[PDB]
Design an enzyme around this catalytic site. Sequence first.
Site, PDB file in Angstrom:
ATOM      1  CG  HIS B 515      42.260  42.342  40.170  1.00  0.00           C
ATOM      2  ND1 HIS B 515      41.475  43.275  40.772  1.00  0.00           N
ATOM      3  CD2 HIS B 515      43.490  42.410  40.777  1.00  0.00           C
ATOM      4  CE1 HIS B 515      42.166  43.877  41.739  1.00  0.00           C
ATOM      5  NE2 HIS B 515      43.418  43.375  41.729  1.00  0.00           N
ATOM      6  CG  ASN B 558      41.112  44.614  45.873  1.00  0.00           C
ATOM      7  OD1 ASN B 558      40.134  44.921  46.570  1.00  0.00           O
ATOM      8  ND2 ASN B 558      41.878  45.534  45.248  1.00  0.00           N
TER       9      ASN B 558
END
Lengths: 570, 579, 59, 59
Positions: B515, B558
Amino acid sequence: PYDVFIAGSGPIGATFAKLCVDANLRVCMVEIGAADSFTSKPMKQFGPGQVPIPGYHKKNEIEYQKDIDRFVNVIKGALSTCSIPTSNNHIATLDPSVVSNSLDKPFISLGKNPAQNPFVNLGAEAVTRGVGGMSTHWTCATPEFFAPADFNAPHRERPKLSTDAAEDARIWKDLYAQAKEIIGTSTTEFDHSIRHNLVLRKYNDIFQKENVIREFSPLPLACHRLTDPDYVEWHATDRILEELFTDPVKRGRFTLLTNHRCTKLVFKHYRPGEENEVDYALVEDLLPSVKKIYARSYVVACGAVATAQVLANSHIPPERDATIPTPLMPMLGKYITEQPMTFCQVVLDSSLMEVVRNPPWPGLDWWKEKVARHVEAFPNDPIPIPFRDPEPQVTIKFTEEHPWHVQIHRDAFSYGAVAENMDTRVIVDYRFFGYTEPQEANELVFQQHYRDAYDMPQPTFKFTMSQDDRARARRMMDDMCNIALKIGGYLPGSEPQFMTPGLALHLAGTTRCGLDTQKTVGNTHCKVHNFNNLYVGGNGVIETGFAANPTLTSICYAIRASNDIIAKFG
Amino acid sequence: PYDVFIAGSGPIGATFAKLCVDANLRVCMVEIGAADSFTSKPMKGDPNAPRSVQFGPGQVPIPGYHKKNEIEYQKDIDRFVNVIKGALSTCSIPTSNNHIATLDPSVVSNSLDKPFISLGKNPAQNPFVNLGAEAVTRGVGGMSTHWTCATPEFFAPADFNAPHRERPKLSTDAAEDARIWKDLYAQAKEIIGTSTTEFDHSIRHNLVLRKYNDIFQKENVIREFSPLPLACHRLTDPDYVEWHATDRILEELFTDPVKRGRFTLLTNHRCTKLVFKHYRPGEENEVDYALVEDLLPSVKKIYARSYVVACGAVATAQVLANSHIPPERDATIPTPLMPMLGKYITEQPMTFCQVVLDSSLMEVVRNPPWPGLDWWKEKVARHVEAFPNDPIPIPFRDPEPQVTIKFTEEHPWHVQIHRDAFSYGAVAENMDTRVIVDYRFFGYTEPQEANELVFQQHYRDAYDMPQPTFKFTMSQDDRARARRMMDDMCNIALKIGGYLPGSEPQFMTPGLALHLAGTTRCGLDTQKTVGNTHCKVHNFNNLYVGGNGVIETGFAANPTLTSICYAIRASNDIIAKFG
Amino acid sequence: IPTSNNHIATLDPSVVSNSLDKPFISLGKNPAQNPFVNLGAEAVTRGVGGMSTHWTCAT
Amino acid sequence: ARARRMMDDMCNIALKIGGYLPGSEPQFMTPGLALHLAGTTRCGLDTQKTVGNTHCKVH
Ligand SMILES: *Cc1cc2c(cc1C)Nc1c([nH]c(=O)[nH]c1=O)N2C[C@H](O)[C@H](O)[C@H](O)COP(=O)(O)OP(=O)(O)OC[C@H]1O[C@@H](n2cnc3c(N)ncnc32)[C@H](O)[C@@H]1O
Ligand SMILES: *Cc1cc2c(cc1C)Nc1c([nH]c(=O)[nH]c1=O)N2C[C@H](O)[C@H](O)[C@H](O)COP(=O)(O)OP(=O)(O)OC[C@H]1O[C@@H](n2cnc3c(N)ncnc32)[C@H](O)[C@@H]1O
Ligand SMILES: *Cc1cc2c(cc1C)Nc1c([nH]c(=O)[nH]c1=O)N2C[C@H](O)[C@H](O)[C@H](O)COP(=O)(O)OP(=O)(O)OC[C@H]1O[C@@H](n2cnc3c(N)ncnc32)[C@H](O)[C@@H]1O
Ligand SMILES: OC[C@H]1O[C@@H](O)[C@H](O)[C@@H](F)[C@@H]1O
Ligand SMILES: OC[C@H]1O[C@@H](O)[C@H](O)[C@@H](F)[C@@H]1O
Ligand SMILES: OC[C@H]1O[C@@H](O)[C@H](O)[C@@H](F)[C@@H]1O
Ligand SMILES: [Mn+2]
Ligand SMILES: [Mn+2]
Ligand SMILES: [Mn+2]
Ligand SMILES: [Mn+2]
């Protein structure tokens, strides 16, 4: 009705499709898995006048040409283990409030086979489901099988197709020539590798002076080196199917149903020992049902386990450990054979780097120039082999005096952690494959009450190698140690070892075809006894105990069977 | 020529492609990797289509399909870990010279002063400041072909001037910011196909969700548990799920002849660098052309009116760094034309564990207390009838739980309680999979200038692009939150089960979340950003960026859905300016 | 026993750690030892009888 | 060179009566493991290359 129905889209099923279509027959092929690997070719890159061809080798993707050690992950994700025994191990350190097994209430675990005795299993035997079968990840080695000088020698790898020795030899010669062209076998695609030449030439030099001479040669491979020599195209089912997609006339004669299970064949009757016929194939579309597919002829080419599985399942017209009896095909699943394998890796001798710098053999200016160049660009690299130099691809052909198959190479199928600390240019792999004699009591049977994840009868293995097979396996391990230590020393973690039975994936004999009708499933054309229109294909048809890689020999049989089909049904 | 050049074919590049082609613009997309994952759909207007079969005449193959959609993996999901490991190429691996004491003394060996030389290790990388599990996937669809499909929204606090926020500001006006995000998030969920109901008839999901809400509703600090929003849909045969990926975004660019005519996708084509009108810092500038290389068995200039770099968080910065070289061994490429390139990077610390469900919960499975769960009782009755000797009364193939706790500033991390295809050790050979539950807690890190991604002048990756090097150190506040997060995970896990041997509470390697964000960060503060809130790169009229690299905040959730929002926003600017 | 300064990637980020420039000081390791020229398994036994209280007795 | 010959001899001899036990396949051990270090106070006839004489008296 189609002229030919084919279950399975591996290289054998593709061979049938190609030959049958080329002879103007209308072919329907069912594949239980997905089209998951593609190239594209123009019509006679995935944009305009190009057509997508499935069954392409996964290793051809540039990422694996650059970082080849990553490809072990592809192969592990493609292999589905056939028979996994149940177990009831106590886990001592569970938190005491959680769900647990006990002596009297074991877990019932999806996928395990309660009928399998782990001591007679082929525990690493596995299958790949998808367009192209296992050919989308295989190593592409395509040796011929050994035939002794004397046609009545006690052992041979290459089966007999005739009781006439001279005809048998001529037939095999041309079949092997044709099967080589189909799959695109070459022995020259590593001829400008330093590592390959070093290993081949040093071994030949060493073994010329030993008291027993051994001949090393290039491993024949189904591949071709590309115009940019850092890349190789490895061959797969896409090569065989190609014109069925790119020729509009052939494309019109070929249907490929993917994610379709051939559940069973249905026969005219269920009386053993009388002339019979397939009536239809029962096929299930597995995506979001049941179809009868009619053809004039039927080919089961689902690989060695699944071809027998289909035919067993077919014995059921449309004690907990009971198996399906198969009296319409009494030899189904009997006489099965698999290959014991020993493995090790070595690091090359440091003295061999001097040979790399000053090779004694003539005709090697190409090598001298690659080494000088690398040496000049990386003066501090202790290894003078260029960075992307291809790995060695060396064999010793099977002989009755040393009756195993030797590969001295680098394989994408690794067996433990990469060595983080050793440079890959100086590692060499050794896989030595043995044979097992065919024996009636060695069997693949199918469960009546347990099923696999695709709802087909669960396979169970009952395999015990013979005393003679064990005696050869000891000699093979001794041979591997002796050979390996001539050029390098064992890499930690890959010292000499036997691998798990089944790991070669060369299971054979499950639908054995030959001249001896009472001990085979089919004849030398792979036609199943008493069925006028049913044929088998794959390694399962091979009736001998062999040590070499079988797929080229299996393609020979596919040719033969296709020509019988063409002869009868054209 | 082309109205838009796009480098990269992940879900962000695909979003630019779809939106632009829908607006009648001509698009050329290059992808350095291969098309390697496909589905097939009928071709609109093809005489064959109505009767066709997948990958027959007249269907068309659509790349970037989710690899997890093959039935092989729907039936044997633990095998999928190998697909994920096959797809990930680690970005920066430090060199090392470890002595191997047990080598045969005759073999080639490293020595103290003569180490082995490995291609693609990074001599410039200090292991102590690395994101050592940061990795990329090269292929059509990028990482969307293996991702877990989680698509939550980012948290926006009540007060627009709160010190921390997950969701970046797109306007200085709070009300306009809220309206903008509300419309973008709706559109992004429709593009990727987010749903929160695809596990609503799983016993495991329902057990975990309902139990946890029953437990935490009573506690003096309430925590709310909800379904994890997921880009997927369950099929009419409920044993299967279609996981969504880039194929859904590109579909009509392959099935519609009018659109297909406006779109060109060149695979195995590397965007090496953009070449600029000039190389003077701080001055108005534009892209002249894209330099592209066909990597298959060559160098071509591609011209467009506008250029989009959507190569992921690492590669997007890499392409832009390399574009700084017009056409001490540890020196990096300076990037004065885009001074904030690769600064303020962020990444998510992650804690993990697995548990085995409490035996006492099997009685809840056999006798659920909640009213109206007739569907559950029926499934359980079917299973116990078929397998009366099975200790576990959960049906075989019951789907995994898919549960979350939305980020709040009181517990500032993202929770997933689920089963994930990305296993981290050996599968548990002895434990039944029906009673295992995974926990992944993701934290955030504060954007700091000194945290950076730079690119090596003298070292290159396998695709001959400049080698990435990370200089990443989380802050003291980031550390104190990470400890609280680990503590929260232990507390929450142990309410319904006990740790599975081998998966006891642990931190993961930095970078494993994948990420990474902030490498081409976009926002209002021009001085501290690479691009504006439309992701136009400062001082270039025709250059845009996309991906998680645009996100300028420290976030825990996310990022894909929010990155899609930026792609829509940026595409709309392109369409308005150039279309 | 040679010195080493290996990074442990999975420590909790709030705990005491080595760094590139600030290694742990591990008493009894030997900063002078080149690992590649070591006899790394060479060892002593201190006690009445020295090694003879555990040896295999081959003579 | 002698160590390679020795490894080969070990493999040849071991396999005459048995097969390698998984985990104990042919391998070299870490240098120094034999504990047979010698010559650190070497005693002999050549005074200029020893520490002591053949009675072990230090020169
Ligand atoms: C995986 C592997 C395999 C080989 C090598 C290495 C690795 C790791 N190396 C190797 C091999 N063989 C060689 O001779 N040389 C090499 O160097 N490998 C084996 C080789 O890959 C096989 O021998 C070959 O594919 C056999 O071909 P085949 O007889 O066509 O069989 P396949 O298994 O490839 O394909 C069969 C096929 O049928 C499908 N199927 C199964 N059941 C059904 C049902 N019920 N209905 C419809 N279809 C079904 C399968 O899914 C599969 O695609
Ligand atoms: C691998 C992974 C990823 C995610 C999850 C799990 C796993 C194991 N789960 C997950 C994620 N995201 C969430 O939001 N929810 C989750 O449940 N994952 C990450 C997600 O997958 C990414 O956020 C997303 O793909 C990003 O999309 P993108 O910004 O489009 O970037 P990609 O990396 O996917 O694709 C970029 C693309 O460009 C190519 N490329 C790179 N360099 C070049 C050059 N020089 N020329 C041309 N093309 C280039 C790539 O090869 C790649 O395809
Ligand atoms: C540990 C071991 C060693 C042997 C074998 C197996 C194992 C695992 N097997 C074996 C060996 N030798 C053979 O010939 N055949 C076998 O099958 N092993 C080695 C053998 O055990 C030694 O060679 C033998 O003891 C040597 O005898 P030594 O010369 O008397 O030396 P030691 O090490 O036994 O005792 C020395 C002694 O002096 C002490 N010491 C050390 N420093 C000081 C100082 N500064 N002050 C006072 N005392 C000191 C020690 O502590 C020790 O007890
Ligand atoms: O395990 C890999 C081996 O598998 C076997 O199936 C192949 O035939 C060999 F070539 C290969 O080395
Ligand atoms: O590492 C696997 C995890 O990685 C992350 O990329 C995903 O966002 C999570 F949902 C997933 O559980
Ligand atoms: O490692 C144990 C070995 O070490 C040595 O110290 C002994 O001399 C050997 F006899 C013994 O087998
Ligand atoms: Mn065997
Ligand atoms: Mn013939
Ligand atoms: Mn014939
Ligand atoms: Mn981190």
